[PDB]
Design a protein around this ligand. Structure first.
Ligand SMILES: NC(=O)c1ccc[n+]([C@@H]2O[C@H](COP(=O)([O-])OP(=O)(O)OC[C@H]3O[C@@H](n4cnc5c(N)ncnc54)[C@H](OP(=O)(O)O)[C@@H]3O)[C@@H](O)[C@H]2O)c1
Ligand SMILES: CCOc1ccc2ccccc2c1-c1cc2nc(N)nc(N)c2cc1C
Length: 157
């Protein structure tokens, strides 16, 4: 299975200055629960943003840099390399990866951040005409998690 994993806001913002525009611990927990034991494929910028591979899953980085050889990270140099990765593969970002993959993936696990943030990077437009809502779950709010959010699982019709 090949899936997208993304958090985007009401206007599809995903990032600002190479980081998330929001602080939302529960989204990171969501990411952990979905991708632990599986494979993440991410662009080079997203990798440098996190700074180190995420534990307990396969971290795959897409880059043109032939000198890229980082401990605990597997490197690929082509989109086509993605299709040879075994198991459940999550396209993990960022904008460039999402743009390249949205037409190719089986499904998407989206965290809709129900606010409007300043962004410099965006998830591409998509329409519910193309995507069945397999589930929609409101995130729970508290002192640490104060931005309303909804976890959507969309499956291509
Ligand atoms: N909210 C979210 O769900 C989420 C998730 C992840 C990231 N983000 C945000 O997304 C933003 C980063 O997105 P971005 O588009 O600027 O960067 P990115 O997608 O993370 O990385 C871009 C880099 O990926 C490599 N790449 C992509 N396609 C390639 C291909 N076909 N062949 C070889 N290399 C390829 C290139 O690396 P080289 O230049 O090294 O060749 C490219 O410069 C940040 O603001 C970050 O915080 C948001
Ligand atoms: C690019 C900045 O995003 C950060 C920064 C630090 C993180 C630390 C732990 C887990 C995820 C992190 C994320 C992060 C959060 C994400 N959240 C969702 N819903 N989807 C993705 N595809 C994500 C991808 C990344 C990389």
């Amino acid at each position: 299975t090949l899936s997208i994993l993304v958090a985007h806001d009401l206007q599809r913002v995903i990032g600002f200055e190479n980081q998330l525009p929001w602080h939302l611990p529960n989204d990171l927990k969501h990411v952990k629960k979905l991708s632990t034991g599986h494979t993440l494929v991410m662009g080079r910028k997203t990798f440098e943003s996190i700074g180190k591979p995420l534990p307990n899953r396969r971290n795959v980085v897409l880059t043109s840099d032939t000198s890229f050889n980082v401990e605990g990270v597997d490197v690929i140099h082509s989109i086509e390399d993605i299709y040879q990765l075994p198991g459940h593969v999550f396209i993990f970002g960022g904008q460039t990866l999402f743009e390249e993959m949205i037409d190719k993936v089986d499904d998407m696990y989206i965290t809709v951040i129900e606010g409007k943030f300043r962004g410099d990077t965006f998830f591409p437009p998509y329409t519910f005409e193309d995507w069945e809502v397999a589930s929609s779950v409101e995130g729970k709010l508290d002192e640490k998690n104060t931005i309303p959010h909804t976890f959507l699982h969309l499956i291509r019709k």
